[PDB]
Each structure stands twice: as C-alpha cells, then as structure tokens.
Structure 1
Amino acid sequence: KYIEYPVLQKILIGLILGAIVGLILGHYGYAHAVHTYVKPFGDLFVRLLKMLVMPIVFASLVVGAASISPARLGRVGVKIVVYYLLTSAFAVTLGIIMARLFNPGAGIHLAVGGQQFQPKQAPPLVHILLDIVPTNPFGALANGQVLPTIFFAIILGIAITYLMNSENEKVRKSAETLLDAINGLAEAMYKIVNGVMQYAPIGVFALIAYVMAEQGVHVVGELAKVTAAVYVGLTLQILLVYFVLLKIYGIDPISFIKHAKDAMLTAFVTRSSSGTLPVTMRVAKEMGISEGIYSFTLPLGATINMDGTALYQGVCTFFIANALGSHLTVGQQLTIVLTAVLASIGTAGVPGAGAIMLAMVLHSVGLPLTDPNVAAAYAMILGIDAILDMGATMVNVTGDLTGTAIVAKTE
C-alpha cells in the first residue's frame, strides 16, 4: 500500500522519526507503554532476519568454497585475520585517545582501594579451538552454531569440488545435483532477505522507538560524556581508518557507503551482528564481491571483528577508573588495548553482550567488580548501554565489509 516508496527513504524515515517518537514518549515516562505496544514490531524484523542466517550462511559457504581454491581460502583467511586484529587493535587506542581528549567519569569523585585480585584469568583457547570442529553438523545447524557450521561448509565445498574432477562420471552428476540445490537454497534466501527489508522501515522505526525511549533519558552529564567520546570515536574509525584503508586499496570510499546502508542500518538499529548477517551478506553479493570470500569473511567477522565494542570497551574502562580517580597510565593503558581486543573477539554477536564483556577488561587492570563504587559506576554505564550498542554494532559490521572488499580486491 506504499505502494513502494524506496527503502533507504522509508528506512531512514522511520529511524529519524521513531527516534523522536521514542525520545518524546521516553522522557515523558512512557517507555513501558513503548515496550508494550511498539517493541514487538521491531522484534518481528529481527525475528525474520535471524530466520535466514542459518541456511544462507551454510548454503552460501558450500558453494563459495566449491567455487574457490583451497589455496585461496587459506590466503584470504590469513589475510582477513591479520587485518581483523589490526582493526580491532586500532579501535581500542582510538577509544583511549577519546576518553583522554574528552574526560568521562572524571568529575564524578568516588575513589576506592582494593585489588587485583589475585586475579585468575586464562581464556580456555584449546577448548574454543577444538570447538569450531562440530560433531554433528546437522546438530550445529539445528541450534545456532555458525562457527562450527562455517568449518563444515568449508570442508564440504572443498570435497564436492574434488568430486567433480573424478574419473567415474556418475558421481560428478551427484556432485552437481547437490551443489546446484544447495545454491538453490542460498540464492532463495537472498531473495527472502529482500522480503524482510520491506518490513525494515517498520522494524527500524519500532527499534529506536524502544531503544531511545528506555535509555535516552540516561544520556546526561558525565554519562553523556561517555556517549560523545564513544560516538565521535566510532565515526572517527569510519573516517580515519576505513575510508583511508579503502582509498589506499583503491576501492571507492563513498561508493562503498553507496553500497548501503542496508547492513549499516540493520546493524545500527538491531545491535545484532548475527541478526544483521543476511543483510550484511546481501550487500556483499550486491556489491560484487566473490562468494568464496564474502560467505566466509562475513560470518567470521560477525563475531571475531567488533571494532565498535572494543572501542567502547576502551572508553568505558576509562570512565569507571576516572570515577574512582584511579589513574591507569603506562602499563594498563597498554593492557586495556590487548584485553579489550580480547574482550571483543570475544564478545558475542547479540545485544550488549559487549557491555557484559566490559567486565573482563576492568578486571584486567586494577579495579575488581565487587567494590560498590566500581559497580556503582558500571551500573551507570549499564543505563547508557543500548545507546552505545547501536553505533558499536554498525561499525562492528562496516569493518567486516571493508575487511571483505579490501581483501577480495587482492584476490
């Protein structure tokens, strides 16, 4: 019945509108009314967007690992990793350098005096690794499990490939029937990801409707100071790092955001990298990148490369050490970077688990969570949370896409 107004109009139309409906209804104390009446529409959006992730990631990866060289996954990968880490590491120091320039937390006097302690630590690495190799891939699918799905689809595509250069040309028949139908699916899902996305307008209005009602109010004083240093910091990653890394790798910076937003805007309002993926992937395809690349740099990036989390993780770690007057200085400044990289790689792909991860990075330096004023300050951040989360996610994703496009213009 629009009939069809263009999507990046209606999407950008509901965003700036529900942000104002949300802020008005929120600051006039209705946020519960908003979480009753509006919310479930901003839910249905993310609902449909999830529904696809499991097929579209599995299907697209079988195909894409079939239609690329085992040699080249293994190069594109080592590329994306050493690119992913480097971007993540930069975003922390670009966060420290924003909480140094701004000063959130300082000017709330609240010091405390006990640590470390002792303390503990050790990411069980061995177990996280053995874990990407699933033991029932039907299983893996059947309940979320994207990383172990990846490592199957990659193993499968590689084996089908091998089936096609085999002597007996009965199996190459089967090998095709499979890989055709698998592509049948993948392709289908990219059609559904357009379906939803005509819902996006509504879903986007009704998401920042709720996120702005129930947490805009908290953006105040020293908390407001944490927003600005984070926001001005994230939109300094975009410009100082991506556009530069796109310009340098000779892919058009402004045509790149021209690919979009779609995934830039579903990342923002959903605050779910995993829920974004379908849209994130359909703007990899639609921008021409190769499937044997994008269907493995994007589902890995959707978890491992959260530049926006490990930035707020930088500047939040500063706020809570500022509010206690604990000056962190040389050694810790450097062990924030390391651990907030860690903490984001790290974080899960869903809403504010980055904030829950923020605990791992605090404990890394002095302050331990148990001390009331520690926690008092953390609580405060846990009220400005979903407001940070929006921008955090939109860069956690935009760094995945630039990671993809810049690796694939080298391959």
Structure 2
Amino acid sequence: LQKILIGLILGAIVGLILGHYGYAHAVHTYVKPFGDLFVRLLKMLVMPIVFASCVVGAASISPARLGRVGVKIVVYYLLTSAFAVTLGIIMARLFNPGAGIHLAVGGQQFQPHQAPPLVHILLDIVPTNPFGALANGQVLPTIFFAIILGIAITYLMNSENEKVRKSAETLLDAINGLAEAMYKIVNGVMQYAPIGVFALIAYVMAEQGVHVVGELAKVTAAVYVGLTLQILLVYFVLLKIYGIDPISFIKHAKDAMLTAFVTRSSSGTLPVTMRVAKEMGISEGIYCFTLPLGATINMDGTALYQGVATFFIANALGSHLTVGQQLTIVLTAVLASIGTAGVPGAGAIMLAMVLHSVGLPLTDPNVAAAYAMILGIDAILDMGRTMVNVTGDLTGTAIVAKTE
C-alpha cells in the first residue's frame, strides 16, 4: 500500500518537472514500458479469474437471485449514471469554461462513424463457439455461458445415480481449483504495483499535463471538483443509509481505486476489483456477476465528463445551449455511458454522439478543431473519471448484497 502512495506522489512530481523541460519523448524510451508490464500482467489474469469465479457463482440459489438481485442492481446502475450528468452540468453552470474564441481552424477529426446495429449486438451477447469468444476476450458473452453452465451442474447433483453426481463433483471442484489459483496470483502481481505506478504517471504528465492553462485550466477544475461530489454526495450517503460503515468501505477498496486511476482501464483493473470484493465478505453469486456487468454498463465517471464537455464546446463557439430543454443531454449521456467501452480514451470518442444529438456535429471544421483542445488533454481527465467508473460498481455491489 504505502510504496504505491509513496511511488505515486514522487512519480508525478518527478515526471511533471521534466515535461516543462522538453523530455516528453525520452520519458517514452524509458518509463512507459514498465507501466505496460504492470498492465499486461493484470490483463493476463482477467480471463480465467472471470470464468472460474462465475461457474462457481451459479452454485448458490439459482432462480431469483441471479435474476432478482440481477434486476436490483439494474435499477441502481441507471439512476447513479443518471444523476452523475445532472451534477456535471450544474458544475458547468456553477463554473463557466469557454470565454476565449476557438483559435485554430482545420484538421477535422474522423466523421463517417457507423453505429449502432442495435439488434445484432444484443444477439452478439449470446456466443456460438463458447471456446472462441472465451479466447478473444469478450467479457460479456463469456459471463452468460458461465451462469448457464453453473445452473446445469446444480441440477446434476440432484439425479439418482452416483456416477451422475460423481463426475459433476469432479468437474466443479476442479474448476474451483482454478478459481483459487487465480485470486492467488492476483496479489503476486500486486507485488510490483509500486514501480508500475511510479512509471505510469511519470509519463502521463510530461506528454500532456504540463499543458493545463487558461480555459483548459477552468474546465479541469469543473471535472475534478464535480467528480469529488459524486464520491461524498452520492456514495458516502448511500453507504451511510444501508448499514455499512462509510470508512470501512474505503479502507478496503483503496487497492482497487489506485489501480483504476493509474491504469485507466476498467477492464484490466477487474481481477484486483474482484479480489477486493472477496476481501470485504461478499458471496460469489453476487459480486462475480455485478462487477463484470458493472465495469461495462455503470459509467458514473464518464457521465460527468460527457456532460461537462458537451457544454464547454457550446460555450467555446457561443451556442445558447437551450434555455430549459438541455435535458436532451441527460438522456444521451446515459445512453452513451452504457455504450462507452473499457480501455482508456473511448469516453471522449463517444462524447462525439452526445454533441451530435443536441446539434453540433464534428463535420463542421471549427467545432472539431475546438474538440482538438479537449482531446489534447484527455488522459488527464481519464484518470479521474475511471476512479468513479469503478468505485460506483463496488458501492452498489455491497448495497445489493446486504438486501438479498
């Protein structure tokens, strides 16, 4: 723990004062592979640790639960993200980012995006080669197969024969072995988190960061201080009502938060998030369902970033942002949040479609050269949103746990 915190501070404040000194492209040839090494070795775990812990997590009460508890949190995930965009727009009207007239014109970003198929992405939730999907990544058709297997072995320990139930105990206990084998490594990769972390911010400061000034200084304030409010106004209040101690939650989830802010992957944070929930006394049927579906649908941090930026660009050109009917951001930023992907960046590239709905496309060359000011400093605002993106799952995971 302490080596991570001592590594994180002196890391950024080593890499910050090399950025003002023109060593951006030397902190690349030195510091930014060790941060990948930390990344790779978290990504290596993700596939077995989700599959084993989810064939085991269908051994507990099979109907309801994985469909009554699963619907509990479905109500939670939409309301949390729904409120997060209300917070971030009110923060962009308590602040005012965009008083300087958008400087450069030219160099337009993309334009002919196509999406969604919509129907043939809901059907792509159900796999065909259970072995293929499981071999690509695919952290959501892999879940669906695991639960439908785990139920099938529950009913198989009920049949009259012994050699029926005597091969099913073999199977399921063997798969349980890997489950234990995969939490077992996940702290032996934690291991090297101090030096991993020291690297990761040492870079993301020299290349972008020694950069923040002006109205980009005003907007970074409205991102972080808007994000602060989500932690202590929505979580420390909903944990406080639902029995659980506020501080005992954050004393335990500290090791998953740090590997979310520093890493910016929600997806490659997930084995260490899965362990932290076993550390605080959660039964498998809940957490190894609500965390993998959670790190792809509950995007609380992204909803505030997507709300506050679809307002910085309205101010930067001078659009009146609809006096009353700006709630058409409130529907779109939720529908973008659930859309938004795991790996870093993709929170902003889906910010494209929430600008599109209220009425400013990136075809217009002076809208999307002023989008180039924000996309210049994206990774900085990604560290922040990713922390809330991943803590918002864990908050609901234990608040649905102590209900059913």
- Alpha carbons of structure 1 residues 11 and 112: separation in structure 2 relative to 1, 3 Å: closer
Note the C-alpha offset of 1:361. Answer: 0.7
Q: TM-score, normalised by structure 1?
A: 0.94
Note the C-alpha offset of 1:290. Answer: 1.3
Q: Distance in 1 between matches of 2:25 and 2:105?
A: 36
The answer to whether the Cα contact below 8 Å between 1:116 and 1:366 also exists between their aligned partners in 2 is no
Q: Deviations over 1:65-84 (max 9, x none)?
A: 12232211101111111100
Q: SS in structure 1 opposite 2:280? A: coil
Q: SS in structure 2 opposite 1:119? A: coil
- Alpha carbons of structure 1 residues 148 and 120: separation in structure 2 relative to 1, 3 Å: closer
- Alpha carbons of structure 1 residues 101 and 107: separation in structure 2 relative to 1, 3 Å: farther
- Alpha carbons of structure 1 residues 279 and 118: separation in structure 2 relative to 1, 3 Å: closer
Q: Distance in 2 between matches of 1:154 and 1:206?
A: 38
The residue aligned with 1:358 is 351
The runs of 5 or more residues in structure 2 that have no matched partner are none
Matched residues, number:
404
Note the C-alpha offset of 1:119. Answer: 12
- Alpha carbons of structure 1 residues 342 and 121: separation in structure 2 relative to 1, 3 Å: farther
Q: Distance in 2 between matches of 1:109 and 1:188?
A: 55
Note the C-alpha offset of 1:253. Answer: 1.1
Note the C-alpha offset of 1:229. Answer: 0.5
* Among 202, 215, 228, the residue aligned to 1:222: 215
Note the C-alpha offset of 1:377. Answer: 1.4
Note the C-alpha offset of 1:110. Answer: 7.2
The residue aligned with 2:188 is 195
Q: Distance in 2 between matches of 1:299 and 1:118?
A: 32
Q: Deviations over 1:363-411 (max 9, x none)?
A: 1111110112211111110111000000110110000100101110111
Q: Distance in 2 between matches of 1:88 and 1:201?
A: 32
Q: SS in structure 2 opposite 1:24? A: coil
Note the C-alpha offset of 1:61. Answer: 0.5
* % identical equivalent positions: 99
The answer to whether the Cα contact below 8 Å between 1:45 and 1:199 also exists between their aligned partners in 2 is yes
Note the C-alpha offset of 1:101. Answer: 0.8
Q: Which stretch shows the higher mean deviation, 400-409 or 123-132?
A: 123-132
- Alpha carbons of structure 1 residues 120 and 43: separation in structure 2 relative to 1, 3 Å: closer
Q: Deviations over 1:70-101 (max 9, x none)?
A: 21110111111110011111111111011111
- Alpha carbons of structure 1 residues 396 and 179: separation in structure 2 relative to 1, 3 Å: same
Q: Distance in 2 between matches of 1:63 and 1:368?
A: 47
The answer to whether the Cα contact below 8 Å between 2:106 and 2:366 also exists between their aligned partners in 1 is no
Q: Deviations over 1:300-334 (max 9, x none)?
A: 11111111111100001111111011021246521
The answer to whether the Cα contact below 8 Å between 2:107 and 2:369 also exists between their aligned partners in 1 is no
Note the C-alpha offset of 1:49. Answer: 0.4
Q: Which stretch shows the higher mean deviation, 200-209 or 322-331?
A: 322-331
The answer to whether the Cα contact below 8 Å between 1:96 and 1:315 also exists between their aligned partners in 2 is yes
Note the C-alpha offset of 1:260. Answer: 2.5
- Alpha carbons of structure 1 residues 34 and 115: separation in structure 2 relative to 1, 3 Å: closer
Q: Deviations over 1:10-29 (max 9, x none)?
A: 11111111111111112212
Note the C-alpha offset of 1:125. Answer: 2.6
- Alpha carbons of structure 1 residues 117 and 298: separation in structure 2 relative to 1, 3 Å: closer
Q: Which stretch shows the higher mean deviation, 99-108 or 379-388?
A: 99-108
Note the C-alpha offset of 1:116. Answer: 17
Note the C-alpha offset of 1:107. Answer: 3.8
Q: Distance in 2 between matches of 1:330 and 1:175?
A: 63
- Alpha carbons of structure 1 residues 117 and 348: separation in structure 2 relative to 1, 3 Å: closer
Q: Distance in 1 between matches of 2:99 and 2:375?
A: 18
The answer to whether the Cα contact below 8 Å between 2:266 and 2:390 also exists between their aligned partners in 1 is yes
The answer to whether the Cα contact below 8 Å between 1:262 and 1:283 also exists between their aligned partners in 2 is yes
Note the C-alpha offset of 1:117. Answer: 16
Note the C-alpha offset of 1:111. Answer: 13
Note the C-alpha offset of 1:113. Answer: 16
Q: Deviations over 1:145-184 (max 9, x none)?
A: 0100010111111111111111112121111111111111
Note the C-alpha offset of 1:40. Answer: 0.3
Q: Deviations over 1:252-282 (max 9, x none)?
A: 1111111131110000000001010001110
Note the C-alpha offset of 1:218. Answer: 2.2
The residue aligned with 2:273 is 280
Q: Distance in 1 between matches of 2:374 and 2:220?
A: 10
Q: TM-score, normalised by structure 2?
A: 0.96
- Alpha carbons of structure 1 residues 187 and 154: separation in structure 2 relative to 1, 3 Å: same
Note the C-alpha offset of 1:211. Answer: 1.1
The answer to whether the Cα contact below 8 Å between 1:114 and 1:367 also exists between their aligned partners in 2 is no
Q: Distance in 1 between matches of 2:55 and 2:285?
A: 9
Flag the structure with higher helix content: 1
- Alpha carbons of structure 1 residues 331 and 123: separation in structure 2 relative to 1, 3 Å: farther
The answer to whether the Cα contact below 8 Å between 2:156 and 2:164 also exists between their aligned partners in 1 is yes
Q: Distance in 1 between matches of 2:47 and 2:355?
A: 34
Q: SS in structure 1 opposite 2:149? A: helix
Q: Distance in 1 between matches of 2:327 and 2:221?
A: 23
